[PDB]
Amino acid sequence: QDLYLRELKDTKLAPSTLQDAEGNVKPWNPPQKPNLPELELQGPEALKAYTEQNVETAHVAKESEEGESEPIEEDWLVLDDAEETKESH
Amino acid sequence: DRIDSVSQLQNVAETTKVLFDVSKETVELESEAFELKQKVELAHEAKAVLDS
Numbered sequence: 001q002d003l004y005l006r007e008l009k010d011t012k013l014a015p016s017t018l019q020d021a022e023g024n025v026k027p028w029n030p031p032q033k034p035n036l037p038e039l040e041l042q043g044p045e046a047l048k049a050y051t052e053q054n055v056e057t058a059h060v061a062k063e064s065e066e067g068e069s070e071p072i073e074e075d076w077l078v079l080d081d082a083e084e085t086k087e088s089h
Numbered sequence: 090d091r092i093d094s095v096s097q098l099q100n101v102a103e104t105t106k107v108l109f110d111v112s113k114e115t116v117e118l119e120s121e122a123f124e125l126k127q128k129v130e131l132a133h134e135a136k137a138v139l140d141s
Contacts, residue, residue, distance in 0.1 A: 061126070
């Protein structure tokens, strides 16, 4: 079918240099080889936080603090404070 | 009335034993939760970044 074959190879050759062959891109002047593979490759990184989220910075968990080894002052102070409130129950 | 009031210290120590034990026990057993929090955050970041 002449209505078929010629439109078929026209729709094949126009993106042939675009996609199949490495002839940059003929239909539109701006280059595509250094744009989507190269300039837009950082596109997700450009929209997002580059070198901050794509690297997935892992912060080591800070050591959970405690009474800081206070076996005398803390216990005595707690006992005294409870004694203060025990007279007013 | 004082007798009735003192009747209630009879067994408070036995229960408050396990109470004071498990209080600090459970409060300090969240260390593994803290260690899991950073792993969960890393996993969330990974899923979000590959979704991106």
